[PDB]
């Protein structure tokens, strides 16, 4: 799906593309993302050669992302402390928690510029 | 035959270091087997004093790993089920390993039992077929307490997979934070009226960010997305 | 024999029990006057062949008797004051069938043993284990109170009693001889006795008043005395009790704490109310009324 | 030829029942322009469960002895990773683990989404 | 170790200088914890804290020769412990504040930047907030005394001080009462240093100098979004105004000669200039009208402030006369 995202870039976005993967199974989403990110990793290495100079991004955007990330980070870190000291458990509902922190990030994972 | 040990590293994505080692050369013949000397044939060779016999049984045999949780009793039936009902001999050089000497269908079967939080524990069965595994679990669940929740583990224990998942997220979110930190460093990179205007020009806000730096970090991050997708499939089956 | 010994162990006829088991096993086991060797040595005979059904078998009864007897032996040795003989039998309760309420009580009991031996840092581990595994976490907090008293860390002691007060608010069987039948109702002196919210709230306020936080202690006293006097509608709060100090002494302590707080008019009202409701405590009533 | 199919990676708490399967076939009189073909299973024999990515790696081994310290050499031909996108099947365009069920018996939602964005 | 084991350092676990490998010491921790019935994270955290006390004792805020080597080796061991899930963070912070005197601000900054705890997790994990306030105030004062012993040490000291101020202004404007109180304490110390007394440019003037130096928002404003940084400067202005309204004498006329621009201290002048840099003119004038309408005043600061204001901003004499006429 072609998309135009005004507030990634300062002048004009690029008319970017979006791959999307729906399914029942979160496991098959993990696998499909693995795949598609494999591909993009390879093609951006292969096109560091031609050097499409990848325009210069805004800052409000970056800090917006940054706070959204540094809440989830401390959440995960306290979860790990609880696991270390056997305070809560290591059985479950932690699994269902971490697989929502996962899902949080896999939606627009790696917009690529 | 010739025996060839290949080694391939996983960290380095250049596929650089794929070693190999020719570790030997195995001869067999029917004249050798007819004198025993390499066979494993049950009961007369019960008392295992060459450990290669044990590793052969642990390689050939069907392996299944169960987790046991009693949520409302305790778990001390297991050593008893193993030593009395199954009449197991522990191996001396490896005391985590019990060998069944109950002379019927279970003979040969090998267990291990690793206990953790005396409610929880884990059982591993090496059986020669899968009906013997079913038989063993019939006998077990007939002995245990009433609310006990067996669970066959395909890809490791949930306690291990929760750590392997939480590491892979606190690596990734650190990397996605490093993005903004290294960015912020780049973003950083009449007389009184004159000084005021000069310091304004100094503090003219850097609204823009180097794309190529962002790119380096998006690859740095993509490798960690990959690690976590693996770690999540391993835990979302379970 | 399992059933007989369950009756005799619920009714404390251990002299008859051990004699029965000496007769049952070979009388070569004659000088083994201990029970917890005879109960183990006692070996029911069969894998229970294709015979008439039964709700319970001899091993599922023996695994119950051993843990119940080991707990009982351990609590007796503790209260009688031999907390090195406890640990053996109180580990033999947990090294066996143990429903997880029996486990929580074994852990508090072992916190108690180590506190008595002078090992607070070991005792805290067992009380923490009990808090974690249990859904009845009064007695652990109580034992911790006693332990911080033994040390001196009095604000911590008081915080533990506050939590216990919060914990006494919050609240299935089987057609099968369980372990929670062969346990007794706990004595007063045991570490597993915990009173009722009224008694415990007075304990909190007493131990706060001795320590010198009279405002907080008086607040706790009024929040106690309301639960005895204002209560007509809900379930009735139990008496602080006959062994404990009677009503008038409580009014007196309340008025003293209230004076120390600086609420002399409220102390006067309490004393006048007591005199309206109705000795030594009257002379003292006039005394506190004077200091007001 | 030495082919080796390595299942899922990242060594676990519990050593699995099959960390890898390996095939070897002798090459005889291949010559120039010729072509050999081998089909291998990768797919679920147990449980109906295939874990991805799976990497299939071929190599060639030369033996000094056969024409007449341990002696041979390996050489590293290719390495393919099979991922989901090669394993999808679009049918209109043209089961419940047995041990788990065993244990249940003896003892007796939204669509998930992923996306990317890429510079045109 | 006195009760379970009969009558704690890495030497104990590692058994008398056998080796130094991470996995060796980690297995030692696991075994010792198996003996004691404590979980491994608590042992490992308490040991790391004990060893930090040792290191920072063995001979002031910073430490740079060989203490940094010991500490960075210990910290690269702590990261392995964390990655293998054998390091309780909160336990570690608690066992640090138990020590609390042996520790140095450079140590806690290293902890922060190398990712073991963060300054926010430390300061939000001490029971008595006042003790942390005083501890910071002392350490920050000795730092601003430092960063003039060398331009080399000044780099690290300015790095950690800019780090601290970034974290403070970030949290306490977007507990954070700790943060705001630390900043107010710094302001009040500086006001009493300049307005109330003499300095000789020997001690405490260097302190207020370096505080205003980090306060100058080129190092800070780059990273920090200037929505909350604006509120920081506004509350800073108000707190410079309000505090110590002595010399409220309405006959404070001849003291205008002594509040003359050249006589008012150059650091007062510079801070006023910088609060003008990071803000705008007309909003400042309106805000000043409202504040000086609302609440009591220290006239010295306001008079030197207008004295710098009118010449600082580009042609706002008419806009000053405007609210004077309104008043």
From Swiss-Prot, chain B:
It is found in: Nucleus. GO terms for biological process: interstrand cross-link repair; negative regulation of double-strand break repair via homologous recombination; positive regulation of double-strand break repair via homologous recombination; replication-born double-strand break repair via sister chromatid exchange. The keyword Zinc-finger does not apply. One of its GO terms (cellular component) is Fanconi anaemia nuclear complex. It comes from the Eukaryota. Keywords: Acetylation, DNA damage, DNA repair, Fanconi anemia, Nucleus. DNA repair protein required for FANCD2 ubiquitination. Belongs to the multisubunit FA complex composed of FANCA, FANCB, FANCC, FANCE, FANCF, FANCG, FANCL/PHF9 and FANCM. The complex is not found in FA patients. This is Fanconi anemia group B protein. It comes from Homo sapiens. The gene is FANCB.
UniProtKB/Swiss-Prot annotation, chain C:
This is Fanconi anemia group G protein. DNA repair protein that may operate in a postreplication repair or a cell cycle checkpoint function. May be implicated in interstrand DNA cross-link repair and in the maintenance of normal chromosome stability. Candidate tumor suppressor gene. The chain holds residues 143 to 462 of 622 of the full protein. Belongs to the multisubunit FA complex composed of FANCA, FANCB, FANCC, FANCE, FANCF, FANCG, FANCL/PHF9 and FANCM. The complex is not found in FA patients. In complex with FANCF, FANCA and FANCL, but not with FANCC, nor FANCE, interacts with HES1; this interaction may be essential for the stability and nuclear localization of FA core complex proteins. The complex with FANCC and FANCG may also include EIF2AK2 and HSP70. It comes from the Eukaryota. Highly expressed in testis and thymus. Found in lymphoblasts. It comes from Homo sapiens (Human). It is found in: Nucleus; Cytoplasm. TPR repeats lie at residues 104-137, 198-231. Changing residue 237 to A: No effect on BRCA2-, FANCA-, FANCF-, nor XRCC3-binding.
Curated annotation (Swiss-Prot), chain D:
It is found in: Nucleus. It comes from the Eukaryota. Disulfide bonds: none annotated. Plays a role in Fanconi anemia-associated DNA damage response network. Regulates FANCD2 monoubiquitination and the stability of the FA core complex. Induces chromosomal instability as well as hypersensitivity to DNA cross-linking agents, when repressed. Belongs to the multisubunit FA complex composed of FANCA, FANCB, FANCC, FANCE, FANCF, FANCG, FANCL/PHF9, FANCM, FAAP24 and FAAP100. Forms a subcomplex with FANCB and FANCL. This is Fanconi anemia core complex-associated protein 100. It comes from Homo sapiens. The gene is FAAP100.
Swiss-Prot record, chain E:
Its main location: nucleus. It is found in: Nucleus; Cytoplasm. Signal peptide: none annotated. Keywords: Cytoplasm, Disease variant, DNA damage, DNA repair, Fanconi anemia, Nucleus, Phosphoprotein. One of its GO terms (biological process) is interstrand cross-link repair. One of its GO terms (cellular component) is nucleus. Phosphorylation is required for the formation of the nuclear complex. Not phosphorylated in cells derived from groups A, B, C, E, F, G, and H. DNA repair protein that may operate in a postreplication repair or a cell cycle checkpoint function. May be involved in interstrand DNA cross-link repair and in the maintenance of normal chromosome stability. Belongs to the multisubunit FA complex composed of FANCA, FANCB, FANCC, FANCE, FANCF, FANCG, FANCL/PHF9 and FANCM. The complex is not found in FA patients. In complex with FANCF, FANCG and FANCL, but not with FANCC, nor FANCE, interacts with HES1; this interaction may be essential for the stability and nuclear localization of FA core complex proteins. The complex with FANCC and FANCG may also include EIF2AK2 and HSP70. Interacts with FAAP20/C1orf86; interaction is direct. This is Fanconi anemia group A protein. It comes from Homo sapiens (Human).
């Amino acid at each position: 799906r072609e998309v135009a995202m005004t507030d990634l870039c300062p002048a004009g976005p690029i008319q970017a593309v979006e791959i999307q993967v729906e399914s029942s199974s979160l496991a098959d989403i993990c696998r499909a993302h693995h795949a598609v990110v494999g591909r993009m990793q390879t093609m951006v290495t292969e096109q560091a050669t031609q050097g499409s100079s990848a325009p210069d991004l805004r800052v409000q955007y970056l800090r917006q992302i940054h706070a959204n990330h540094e809440t989830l980070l401390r959440e995960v870190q306290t979860l790990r402390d609880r696991l270390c000291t056997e305070d809560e458990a290591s059985s479950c509902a932690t699994a269902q928690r971490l697989l929502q922190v996962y899902r949080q990030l896999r939606h627009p994972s790696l917009i690529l510029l | 035959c010739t025996v060839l040990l290949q080694i391939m590293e996983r960290e380095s994505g250049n596929c650089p270091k794929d070693r190999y080692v020719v570790c030997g050369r195995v001869f067999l013949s029917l004249e050798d087997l007819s004198t025993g000397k390499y066979l494993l044939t049950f009961p007369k060779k019960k008392p295992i004093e060459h450990m290669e016999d044990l590793f052969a049984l642990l390689a050939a045999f069907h392996k299944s790993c169960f987790q046991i949780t009693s949520p409302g009793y305790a778990l001390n039936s297991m050593k008893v089920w193993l030593l009395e009902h199954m009449k197991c001999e522990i191996i001396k050089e490896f005391p985590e390993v019990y060998f069944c000497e109950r002379p019927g269908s279970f003979y040969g079967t090998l267990f291990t039992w690793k206990q953790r939080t005396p409610f929880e524990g884990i059982l591993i069965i090496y059986s020669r077929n899968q009906t013997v595994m079913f038989q063993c679990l019939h006998n077990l669940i007939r002995i245990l307490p009433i609310n006990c929740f067996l669970k066959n583990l395909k890809s490791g224990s949930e306690n291990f997979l929760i750590d392997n998942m939480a590491f892979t997220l606190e690596k990734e979110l650190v990397t996605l934070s490093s993005l903004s930190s290294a960015i912020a460093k780049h973003e950083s990179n009449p007389y009184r009226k004159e000084l005021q205007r000069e310091k304004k020009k100094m503090l003219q806000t850097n609204l823009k960010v180097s794309g190529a730096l962002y790119r380096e970090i998006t690859l740095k991050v993509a490798e960690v997305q990959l690690k976590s997708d693996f770690a999540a499939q391993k835990l979302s089956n379970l | 024999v399992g059933l007989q010994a369950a009756l005799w162990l619920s009714a404390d006829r251990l002299g008859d029990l051990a004699l029965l088991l000496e007769t049952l096993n070979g009388s070569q086991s004659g000088a083994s006057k201990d029970l917890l060797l005879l109960l183990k040595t006692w070996s029911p005979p069969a894998e229970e062949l294709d015979a008439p059904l039964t709700l319970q078998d001899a091993q599922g009864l023996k695994d119950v008797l051993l843990t119940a007897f080991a707990y009982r032996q351990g609590l007796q040795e503790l209260i009688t004051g031999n907390p090195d003989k406890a640990l053996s039998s109180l580990h033999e309760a947990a090294s066996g069938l143990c429903p997880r309420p029996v486990l929580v009580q074994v852990y508090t009991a072992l916190g108690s043993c180590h506190r008595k031996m002078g090992n607070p840092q070991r005792a805290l581990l067992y009380l923490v284990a009990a808090l974690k595994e249990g859904s009845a976490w009064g007695p652990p907090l109580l034992e911790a109170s006693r332990l911080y008293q033994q040390l001196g860390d009095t604000t911590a002691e008081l915080e533990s009693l506050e939590l216990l007060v919060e914990a006494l608010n919050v609240p299935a069987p089987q057609f099968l001889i369980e372990v929670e039948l062969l346990l007794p109702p706990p004595d007063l002196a045991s570490p597993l006795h915990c009173g009722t919210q009224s008694q415990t709230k007075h304990i909190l306020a007493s131990r706060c008043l001795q320590t010198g936080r009279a405002g907080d202690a008086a607040e706790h006293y009024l929040d106690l005395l309301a639960l005895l006097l204002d209560s007509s509608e809900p379930r009735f709060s139990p008496p602080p009790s006959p062994p404990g100090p009677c009503m008038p002494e409580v009014f007196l302590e309340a008025a003293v704490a209230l004076i120390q707080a600086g609420r002399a008019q409220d102390a006067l009202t309490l004393c006048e109310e007591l005199l309206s409701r109705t000795p030594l405590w009257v002379s003292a009533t006039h005394l506190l009324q004077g200091q007001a | 030829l030495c082919i080796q199919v390595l299942t899922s990676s990242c060594a676990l708490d519990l050593d699995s029942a099959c960390s890898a399967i390996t095939y070897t076939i002798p090459v005889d009189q291949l010559g120039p322009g010729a072509r050999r073909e081998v089909t291998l299973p990768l797919g679920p024999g147990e449980n109906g469960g295939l874990d991805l990515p799976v990497t299939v790696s071929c190599t060639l081994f030369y033996s000094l002895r056969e024409v007449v310290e341990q002696e041979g050499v390996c050489l590293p031909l290719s390495r393919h990773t099979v991922d989901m996108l090669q394993c999808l099947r679009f049918p209109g365009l043209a089961t419940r683990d047995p041990v788990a069920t065993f244990l249940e018996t003896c003892r007796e939602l939204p669509p998930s989404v992923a996306s990317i964005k890429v510079s045109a | 170790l006195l009760e379970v084991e009969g009558p704690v350092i890495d030497c104990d676990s590692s058994e008398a200088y056998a080796n130094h490998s991470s996995s060796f010491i980690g297995s030692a921790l696991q075994d010792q914890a198996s003996r004691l019935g404590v979980p491994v994270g608590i042992l490992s955290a308490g040991m790391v804290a004990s060893s930090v006390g040792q290191i920072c004792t063995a001979p002031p805020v910073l430490l740079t020769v060989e203490q940094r080597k010991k500490l960075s080796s210990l910290l690269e061991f702590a990261q392995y412990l964390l990655a293998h899930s054998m390091f309780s963070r909160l336990s570690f912070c608690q066992e640090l504040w138990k020590i609390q005197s042996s520790l140095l601000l450079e140590a806690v900054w290293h902890l922060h930047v190398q990712g073991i705890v963060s300054l926010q997790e430390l300061l939000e994990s001490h029971p008595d907030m006042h003790a942390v306030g005083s501890w910071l105030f002392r350490n920050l004062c000795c730092l601003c005394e430092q960063m003039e012993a060398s331009c080399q040490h000044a780099d690290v000291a300015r790095a950690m001080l800019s780090d601290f101020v970034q974290m403070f202004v970030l949290r306490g404007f977007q507990m954070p009462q700790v943060t705001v109180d630390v900043l107010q304490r710094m302001l009040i110390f500086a006001l009493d240093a300049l307005a109330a007394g003499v300095q000789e440019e020997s001690s405490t003037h260097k302190i207020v100098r370096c505080w205003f130096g980090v306060f100058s928002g080129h190092t800070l404003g780059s990273v920090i979004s200037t929505d909350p940084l604006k509120r920081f400067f506004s509350h800073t202005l108000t707190q410079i105004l309000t505090h110590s309204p002595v010399l409220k004498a309405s006959d404070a006329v001849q003291m205008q000669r002594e509040w003359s621009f050249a006589r008012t201290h150059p650091l007062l002048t510079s801070l006023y200039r910088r609060l003008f840099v990071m803000l705008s003119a007309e909003e400042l004038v309106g805000h000043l009208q409202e504040v000086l309408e609302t609440q009591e005043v220290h006239w010295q600061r306001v008079l030197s402030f207008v004295s710098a204001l009118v010449v600082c901003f580009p042609e706002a004499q008419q806009l000053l006369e405007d609210w004077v006429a309104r008043l």
